[PDB]
Write a protein that binds this DNA or RNA. Structure first.
Ligand code: ADP
Ligand code: BEF
Lengths: 452, 92, 99, 84, 93, 98, 79, 102, 89
DNA sequence: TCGGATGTATATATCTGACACGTGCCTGGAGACTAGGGAGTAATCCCCTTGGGCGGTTAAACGCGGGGGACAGCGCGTACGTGCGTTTAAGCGGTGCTAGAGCTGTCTACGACCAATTGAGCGGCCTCGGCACCGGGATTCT
DNA sequence: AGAATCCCGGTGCCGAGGCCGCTCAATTGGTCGTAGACAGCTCTAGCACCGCTTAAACGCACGTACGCGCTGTCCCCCGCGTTTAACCGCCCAAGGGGATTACTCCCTAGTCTCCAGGCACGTGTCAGATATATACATCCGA
């Protein structure tokens, strides 16, 4: 907790100079067990005044829970939903009169964006705190426009991956967290590496997973390729050439003359490399999910998952599965549910309070729902799964920092068992192209880390 | 780079209703109307010169293009005004 | 040029358009003048009706609805613009043989 | 067995939309067999126009249907469209 | 309210407005499926699909208001598919 | 006396006039009609004798087309008789003057 | 001159018979006499304009065919 | 001096079509394949109508085509009735059509 | 007139059928009408693209726009066959 | 259900006047060179159509009275169809006879082409108020 | 009497109007060659008067069957309320597409030179018209 005591030493300092800061603390530690600490440091004597917290739907819940467990009594309230939010607005506390009962205002990015009018009226907010800074990495996003209408006399940004894509996301954030850094001229950084470290030493504060305490044994991220099977090769060529919509149209049970999905070959070849059923399910209606239930073994990457999982049940340590889409997680669930495994799943389609209890059950150690399906953006940010021990990323791309945030989900203060990561992939395929692109993006990331 | 009839329609409107203004959608509607009418009259004049054997489009067959393209009471005024201009153009 | 004629439209641009579209081989001198006068006349008769329809609605700026109403009231213009649909102009209100 | 969640696009034109169109036409009562008749005359009209607007596009070597092809296709059928 | 009184409310409400009466996304999806049988792998400008909807809705509104003259001619108030066919028979479609 | 029932001599007329191709109006009154009509636009006119023929044969093909769809309006209304209502309906959903 | 009455009732009945009609009401004749005059007025007003453009004093047979083609009515058989 | 028609294998006058395309100045220049293409299309349409008319004349047990047969052939067929939708063949007549008691 | 050529085509499809003096007038009018429809559609096609030449692609698009579906499908093949024989042979 | 009034449908003829070839010049073909440039086929930067998501929250879908509109049947009587005996007037043929439409010859004016100006318009800077746009109450309503 | 509604104070904000630096369009002047208008003549083209025949229009009487109104039944469409899922949506990503400019060639427009077509006019040879005749088929009323 020492680091977290240096985390509260530096946000009490920021409060002093009248500065704004980007808490880029390492993901998987501190942050919130450090945000509420600063918030009690001021709620004591300094009160709360207009205090507003905005965060992703999944975290809002975890935050309320943490408040209920770390702080003895912080008047707080979760302003979630619409129309039902109108009643709690006043059964909250006086309109603008801020007393020892004025409850902490916790909202979401949608609510904040859709009805800023309501909160626009409130006094200069003592401290607006935005949980996931990456949300504002675009300088034309409508949330940013609506976020300026608020009269804010102080700002704060929490994150763990400040830059992911390029430097312009650093540029857009700065202007926001600190408009004293307007610099709306492409920036002057572009030797210079040191010059950038002069501007950024004052605010950015990052730690590291190694820190000092052993706690979490080192993790291992390892890539285990698979060999594309014959049928997938047949599908791939019939696309590299053409007439796939027709050779497969030979069946085409539904949507006769199914639209040639000949767009962005990369994508219609990645979907193949994920599982060929995705293509077959559309060209031919096939109301029936693969009835043989061993046609799933035609996918090479599926067969490597299966064997991995049989060897990881040999020990039973709970696994984690990630994917880019939700059709593919669905195929997986079908497959395993036929064998009989009990699965829990939280994608974006599932509701909020529904997914919160699923975790509260998955977190129940006695219950044997070991498997846990989870889509990237779905619930790869803000969820503690110390119960699980192994993360399998079926597929992820276009932004490497997307994946990391997931791995940490399992690997976070309190995870005693050492963590592995199994980035599956298919050798000599479109997947490797993406893998190399990701490596390129990381290359940039490591030049950024050398900067650090 | 893109030429239209915006200036001239605006000046005509200020000449008719000194205080009314016009939005952009209505301005586009009015531009399209003028283009449509120009194309109609010009194509009819060309074809009508082609019926006779003449390679020249004079003013007196802008007359009859107008009398074929415009209906009744609308043409009898337009024709008149046309003659007006031409007289004031030449005996100037 | 087109100040000697009392017109408000460009005779020179009209002549450029007429000679560009290759409607004939030779274009006379009174042809752009005649065609430019009969266009400002039609513009002036549509705009007056549209402004009148604007005045009734207690408005000071014409909108597409006003052009629609002005065209659909008058008989001559409705006969000329019989197959045109003024993008977003509504319809002429009408009820038949019932309360 | 699950998975299949598809419907003829023709239906996306819903009964309330057809009633709104009829109400703007002046109609007071509507039989229940109107909807499948309107939904069939609309498709005929629409595929007469798209067929010409795509022919006007194939000539120009383009791959994008522009708002001007559609205007020319509509003018070919006796109906003029002002304002784009 | 009694049957037939909030209908005239709708005739009055919808003849004053100017906005579009078909939802945009299903109409776009329809116009895309009925062009797959002329030219595969085709894209539309966003203003090309707004121009198709303006013309289609105008066509249907214009057809509904003489389909209603045929129903009144036969001494009814309810439009039936027989009226649409008479209206299109004489217009030439 | 031997009479025919009403509407049997009318059906043999329909068959008779739908096989022939002749021109069913008297030629002199039609010419006087068109000269009276043209007497407004220009006075003291002359008519090439093949122009009145073109006019007559353009004018009957129009009336024959109008009658065969004022007869679709009558059958839509559960009748076999045509009244002016049918002509007005037909001309109004053709746009002939609307 | 009452030259519109020179379109007699038998001739109108003949035209209706070629059109397929079985019974005629007694008021059809004055309606037909009026809707023929409008058609002739439109066509003749265009034909005479074509004539006066040519500086001729004789309505000829193309003036009529051109006037007809202009109003949607193409006619074959007269040049 | 072989004519253009023989080179194209047609019966219509490719050269006379090219002259008709020039005169009237539909544009400035005219390619070398435009009149050949246009003449081939005109011959095709002519043979279509003439074949249907000849069939209609045999059906009426004749051996000489008259306007009635052209009317019958045009207004029986689908595409031709669409194309010649609003044309009046003179000295032809409407086809038989009795509906209901009428 | 096209009468000569029209007669030739007849003697190809019905070697024993003749034609009345008035029917040949009809056929002449039909050919003259179709030619002018196609030549004006080609003119518009060239002007919409700002090209000064009417090649055999303007004629093909004019045929697709003017003739009804099954008729246009066969007219196109006839014409392309003629142009191929013209250039190659 | 027959027997009768006619109505169309087959078969004799003549009889045109037309459709078919064969001439005659005379204007348009095709053939050969030359010129200019108008496409044709490249190379580059981009604004731009094309997938996922993901919320969410209007709008759509479903169900339930219950009346009011469609449709069938029945009666009456009025206007239109059929056939017959007058009454016009269109349509065959003969006279002319002017008022045009068509072609050619001749000169003066008028429009295309081309050089050198310069002030019109178009694309892109700002700035403020007439559109909207919200509650909040007096008035109709069936 | 619970339901329907306008007008009048309160609301922002972004699109319409101004300014602009400009550069390429439209003006003035000057030549040339050939379209105008025009005058003269000729031969079609149009119109009009007359007498005769006969076919069509016109009037009239009956009678009937079709239009129109009234009444009853039942069924299906409308209005309202609840719950589900979809369009107007915030974000994500690569891309292909689309209007740009490039030397380069070859492909049309010319100016001409003659063989070739075609169009017009002068003749016969009908073949589909028409009239008389003969069955073979159909409305009609009882
Ligand atoms: N200072 C602390 N005291 C007690 N438990 C702690 C402390 N820091 C971390 N933890 C435990 O580790 C978990 C992970 O830390 P958390 O604050 O959720 O991380 P993050 O920074 O990702 O929000 C906490 O939920 C809690 O159970
Ligand atoms: F709140 Be932590 F980033 F999971």
């Amino acid at each position: 907790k020492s680091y977290q005591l240096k985390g509260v030493k530096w946000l009490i300092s920021l409060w002093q100079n009248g500065l704004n800061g980007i808490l880029a603390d390492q993901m998987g530690l501190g942050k919130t067990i450090q945000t509420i600490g600063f918030l009690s440091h001021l709620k004591g004597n300094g009160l709360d005044g207009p205090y507003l917290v905005i965060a992703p739907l999944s975290t809002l819940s975890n935050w309320f829970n943490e408040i209920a467990r770390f702080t003895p009594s912080i008047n707080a309230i979760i302003y979630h939903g619409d129309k039902n939010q109108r009643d709690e607005l006043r059964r909250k506390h006086m309109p603008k009169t801020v007393g020892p009962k004025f409850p902490i205002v916790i909202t979401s990015y949608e609510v904040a964006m859709n009805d800023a009018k309501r909160i626009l009226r409130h006094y200069p907010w003592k401290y607006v705190v935005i949980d996931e800074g990456h949300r504002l990495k675009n300088h034309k996003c409508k949330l940013l426009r609506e976020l300026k209408h608020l009269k804010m006399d102080n700002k704060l940004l929490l994150t763990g991956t400040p830059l992911q894509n390029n430097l312009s996301e650093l540029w857009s954030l700065l202007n926001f967290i600190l408009p004293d850094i307007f610099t709306s001229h492409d920036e002057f950084e572009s030797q210079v590496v040191s010059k950038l470290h002069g501007i950024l030493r004052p605010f950015i504060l990052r730690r590291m997973k190694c820190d000092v305490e052993l706690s979490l044994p080192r993790k291992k991220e390892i890539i285990m390729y698979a060999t594309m099977t014959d049928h997938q090769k047949k599908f791939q060529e019939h696309l590299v050439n053409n007439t796939l919509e027709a050779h497969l149209g030979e069946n085409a049970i539904r949507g006769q003359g199914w639209k040639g999905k000949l767009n962005n070959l990369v994508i219609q070849l990645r979907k193949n490399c994920n599982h060929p059923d995705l293509l077959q399910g559309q060209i031919d209606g096939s109301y029936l999910y693969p009835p043989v239930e061993e046609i799933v073994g035609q996918c090479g990457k599926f067969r490597l998952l299966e064997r991995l999982l049989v060897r990881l049940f040999a020990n039973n340590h709970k696994v984690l599965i990630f994917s880019q889409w939700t059709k593919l997680l669905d195929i997986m669930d079908y497959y395993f549910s036929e064998k009989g495994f009990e699965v829990c799943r939280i994608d974006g389609s599932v509701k909020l309070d529904e997914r919160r209890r699923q975790i509260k059950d998955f977190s129940d150690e006695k219950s044997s729902c070991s498997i846990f399906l989870l889509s990237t953006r779905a619930g790869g940010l803000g969820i503690n799964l110390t119960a699980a021990d192994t993360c399998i990323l079926y597929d992820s791309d276009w932004n490497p920092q997307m994946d990391l945030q997931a791995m940490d989900r399992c690997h976070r203060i309190g995870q005693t068992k050492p963590v592995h990561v199994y980035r599956l992939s298919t050798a000599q395929s479109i997947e490797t192209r993406v893998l190399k692109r990701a490596y390129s993006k990381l290359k940039l990331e490591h030049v950024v880390i050398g900067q650090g | 780079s893109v030429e239209t009839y915006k200036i001239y329609i605006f000046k005509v409107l200020k000449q008719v209703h000194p205080d009314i203004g016009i939005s952009s959608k209505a301005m586009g509607i009015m531009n399209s109307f003028i283009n449509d009418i120009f194309e109609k009259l010009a194509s009819e004049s060309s074809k009508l010169a082609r019926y006779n054997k003449k390679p020249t489009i004079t003013s007196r067959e802008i007359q009859t293009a107008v009398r074929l393209v415009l209906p009744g009471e609308l043409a009898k005024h337009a024709v008149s005004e046309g003659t007006k201009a031409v007289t004031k153009f030449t005996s100037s | 040029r087109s100040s000697k004629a009392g017109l408000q439209f460009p005779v020179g641009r009209i002549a450029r358009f007429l000679k560009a579209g290759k409607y004939a081989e030779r274009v006379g001198a009174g042809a752009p003048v005649y065609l430019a006068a009969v266009l400002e006349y039609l513009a002036a008769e549509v705009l007056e009706l549209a402004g009148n329809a604007a005045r009734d609605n207690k408005k000071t700026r014409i909108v597409p609805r006003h052009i629609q109403l002005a065209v659909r009231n008058d008989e001559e213009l409705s006969k000329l613009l019989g197959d045109v649909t003024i993008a977003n102009g509504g319809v002429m209100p009408n009820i038949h043989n019932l309360l | 067995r699950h998975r299949k969640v598809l419907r003829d696009n023709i239906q996306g034109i819903t009964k309330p939309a057809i009633r709104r169109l009829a109400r703007r036409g002046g109609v007071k009562r509507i039989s229940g067999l109107i909807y499948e008749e309107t939904r069939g005359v609309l498709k005929i009209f629409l595929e007469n126009v798209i067929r010409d607007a795509v022919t006007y596009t194939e000539h120009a070597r383009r791959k994008t249907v522009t708002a001007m092809d559609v205007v020319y296709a509509l003018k070919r059928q006796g109906r003029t469209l002002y304002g784009f | 309210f009694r049957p037939g009184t909030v209908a005239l409310r709708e005739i009055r409400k919808y003849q004053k407005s100017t906005e579009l009466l078909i939802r945009k996304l299903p109409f776009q999806r329809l116009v895309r499926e009925i062009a797959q049988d002329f030219k595969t792998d085709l894209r539309f400008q966003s203003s090309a699909v707004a121009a198709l909807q303006e013309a289609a809705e105008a066509y249907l509104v214009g057809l509904f208001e003489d389909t209603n003259l045929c129903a009144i001619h036969a001494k009814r108030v309810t439009i039936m598919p027989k009226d649409i066919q008479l209206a299109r028979r004489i217009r030439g479609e």
